[PDB]
Design an enzyme around this catalytic site. Structure first.
Site, PDB file in Angstrom:
ATOM      1  N   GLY A  71      14.437   1.159 -20.774  1.00 17.30           N
ATOM      2  CA  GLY A  71      13.945   2.506 -20.977  1.00 17.30           C
ATOM      3  C   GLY A  71      15.093   3.444 -21.261  1.00 17.30           C
ATOM      4  O   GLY A  71      16.234   3.191 -20.862  1.00 17.30           O
ATOM      5  N   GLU A  72      14.788   4.531 -21.962  1.00 17.20           N
ATOM      6  CA  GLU A  72      15.778   5.541 -22.315  1.00 17.20           C
ATOM      7  C   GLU A  72      15.225   6.903 -21.931  1.00 17.20           C
ATOM      8  O   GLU A  72      14.129   7.274 -22.363  1.00 17.20           O
ATOM      9  CB  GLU A  72      16.108   5.493 -23.808  1.00 17.20           C
ATOM     10  CG  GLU A  72      17.453   6.099 -24.166  1.00 17.20           C
ATOM     11  CD  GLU A  72      17.709   6.092 -25.661  1.00 17.20           C
ATOM     12  OE1 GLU A  72      18.359   7.036 -26.160  1.00 17.20           O
ATOM     13  OE2 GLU A  72      17.258   5.140 -26.336  1.00 17.20           O
TER      14      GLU A  72
ATOM     15  N   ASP B 212       5.485  13.025  -9.410  1.00 14.13           N
ATOM     16  CA  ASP B 212       5.308  12.771 -10.836  1.00 14.13           C
ATOM     17  C   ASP B 212       4.571  11.450 -11.037  1.00 14.13           C
ATOM     18  O   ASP B 212       4.951  10.616 -11.860  1.00 14.13           O
ATOM     19  CB  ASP B 212       6.656  12.779 -11.558  1.00 14.13           C
ATOM     20  CG  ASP B 212       6.519  12.949 -13.070  1.00 14.13           C
ATOM     21  OD1 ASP B 212       5.454  13.396 -13.539  1.00 14.13           O
ATOM     22  OD2 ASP B 212       7.488  12.633 -13.792  1.00 14.13           O
TER      23      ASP B 212
HETATM   24  N1  LIG Z   1      12.944  -1.062 -12.141  1.00 11.31           N
HETATM   25  C1  LIG Z   1      12.489  -1.227 -13.395  1.00 11.31           C
HETATM   26  N2  LIG Z   1      12.036  -2.398 -13.892  1.00 11.31           N
HETATM   27  C2  LIG Z   1      11.595  -2.497 -15.165  1.00 11.31           C
HETATM   28  N3  LIG Z   1      11.570  -1.454 -16.019  1.00 11.31           N
HETATM   29  C3  LIG Z   1      12.000  -0.226 -15.637  1.00 11.31           C
HETATM   30  C4  LIG Z   1      12.496  -0.050 -14.272  1.00 11.31           C
HETATM   31  N4  LIG Z   1      12.854   1.231 -14.125  1.00 11.31           N
HETATM   32  C5  LIG Z   1      12.611   1.847 -15.306  1.00 11.31           C
HETATM   33  N5  LIG Z   1      12.108   0.977 -16.198  1.00 11.31           N
HETATM   34  C6  LIG Z   1      11.736   1.329 -17.575  1.00 11.31           C
HETATM   35  O1  LIG Z   1      12.461   2.489 -18.015  1.00 11.31           O
HETATM   36  C7  LIG Z   1      11.540   3.561 -18.295  1.00 11.31           C
HETATM   37  C8  LIG Z   1      12.132   4.908 -17.978  1.00 11.31           C
HETATM   38  O2  LIG Z   1      12.690   4.892 -16.676  1.00 11.31           O
HETATM   39  P1  LIG Z   1      12.491   6.190 -15.758  1.00 11.31           P
HETATM   40  O3  LIG Z   1      13.269   6.000 -14.480  1.00 11.31           O
HETATM   41  O4  LIG Z   1      11.012   6.526 -15.745  1.00 11.31           O
HETATM   42  O5  LIG Z   1      13.241   7.234 -16.736  1.00 11.31           O
HETATM   43  P2  LIG Z   1      12.703   8.700 -17.157  1.00 11.31           P
HETATM   44  O6  LIG Z   1      12.366   9.523 -15.941  1.00 11.31           O
HETATM   45  O7  LIG Z   1      11.701   8.577 -18.280  1.00 11.31           O
HETATM   46  O8  LIG Z   1      14.098   9.232 -17.766  1.00 11.31           O
HETATM   47  P3  LIG Z   1      14.829  10.566 -17.241  1.00 11.31           P
HETATM   48  O9  LIG Z   1      16.290  10.435 -17.465  1.00 11.31           O
HETATM   49  O10 LIG Z   1      14.565  10.742 -15.666  1.00 11.31           O
HETATM   50  S1  LIG Z   1      14.050  12.201 -18.268  1.00 11.31           S
HETATM   51  C9  LIG Z   1      10.276   3.234 -17.474  1.00 11.31           C
HETATM   52  O11 LIG Z   1       9.106   3.845 -17.969  1.00 11.31           O
HETATM   53  C10 LIG Z   1      10.257   1.709 -17.572  1.00 11.31           C
HETATM   54  O12 LIG Z   1       9.678   1.280 -18.799  1.00 11.31           O
END
Ligand SMILES: Nc1ncnc2c1ncn2[C@@H]1O[C@H](COP(=O)(O)OP(=O)(O)OP(O)(O)=S)[C@@H](O)[C@H]1O
Ligand SMILES: [Mg+2]
Ligand SMILES: [Mg+2]
Length: 270
Positions: free
Chosen positions: A15-16, A129
């Site tokens: 993820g990004e 969230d």
């Molecule tokens: N522990 C994990 N295992 C597998 N996939 C993950 C995991 N953590 C995150 N991802 C993937 O990465 C995506 C984004 O990670 P998040 O932590 O939700 O980032 P975000 O909040 O969208 O980014 P920011 O920087 O907080 S705006 C998720 O929706 C997943 O698809």
């Protein structure tokens, strides 16, 4: 004492985000698979303290329906968070647009979501969230609440804190977050779980925003449930949603009572 990259091979971008990236990392000697959230603390003034809070909350968590925190490293401005790798991806990708998913699957995911939220609220943490993009799935499709970057303490030393900050995602936020100056944390998480369930059963979100300005929300308050997404939802889960998506948080159903709900306890077949 040696660099992160000497111990960990980044195999896959998972993820990004705006402030970080999540990589699938494999240990160069152990071969164990981990998700690493990489955060550049230069991108925001208070990110250093926001990521420290996220780490402190993560260290309080240990539940089968919450992504597990393994530890953290710092290398200059870079913060590495090691998390349980969720092979199954996001719940969001199991939601067929405008369709949703089979009711038994929705019920099962809802059961696991409630278990995680009960756990969080029991240790005094609110996620703030909850949405399908932050509900991940392991290799056996067990649901795991993910991303505590907006989470905060609402109960500490047996004293509750009311919240006053606006955050989350507008289709999922409870109306009191848009209207009241202070609000209780638990009913806000309950409300967003109901939106998640609506999305699982209908494949769409009911409103942009639970505002008086938003016609879709007003039609719901007038219980025009012949309209979408409600007409796609069997009357049994819809009775539960009618109890969750209640405007006044003092009248909104609590989780102990969600657990007593007919549909919640209805045995369902494929
Ligand atoms: N522990 C994990 N295992 C597998 N996939 C993950 C995991 N953590 C995150 N991802 C993937 O990465 C995506 C984004 O990670 P998040 O932590 O939700 O980032 P975000 O909040 O969208 O980014 P920011 O920087 O907080 S705006 C998720 O929706 C997943 O698809
Ligand atoms: Mg997130
Ligand atoms: Mg995030």
């Amino acid at each position: 004492a040696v660099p992160f990259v000497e111990d960990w091979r980044l195999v896959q971008t998972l993820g990004e985000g705006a402030y970080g990236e999540v990589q699938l990392a494999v240990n160069r000697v152990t071969e164990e698979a981990v998700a690493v959230k990489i955060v550049d603390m230069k991108r925001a003034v208070d990110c250093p303290e926001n990521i420290k809070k996220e780490i402190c909350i993560n260290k309080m968590l240990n539940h089968e329906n919450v992504v597990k925190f393994y530890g953290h490293r710092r290398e200059g401005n870079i913060q590495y968070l090691f998390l349980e790798y969720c092979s199954g991806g996001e719940l969001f990708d199991r939601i067929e647009p405008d369709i949703g998913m089979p009711e038994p699957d929705a019920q099962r995911f809802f059961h696991q979501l409630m278990a995680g939220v009960v756990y969080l609220h029991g240790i005094g943490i609110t996620h703030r969230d909850i949405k399908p993009e932050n509900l991940l799935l392991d290799e056996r499709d067990n649901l795991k609440i993910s991303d505590f970057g907006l989470a905060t303490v609402f109960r500490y030393n047996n004293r509750e804190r009311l919240l006053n900050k606006m955050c989350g995602t507008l289709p999922y936020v409870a109306p009191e977050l848009l209207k009241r100056r202070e609000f209780h944390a638990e009913p806000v998480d309950v409300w967003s779980c109901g939106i998640v369930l609506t999305a699982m059963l209908a494949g769409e979100l009911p409103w942009d925003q639970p505002s008086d300005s938003c016609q879709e929300y007003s039609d719901w308050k007038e219980k025009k449930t012949y309209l979408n997404p409600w007409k796609k939802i069997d009357s049994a889960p819809l009775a539960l949603l009618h109890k969750i998506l209640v405007e006044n948080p003092s009248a909104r159903i609590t989780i102990p009572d969600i657990k007593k709900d007919r549909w919640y306890n209805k045995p369902l077949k494929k």
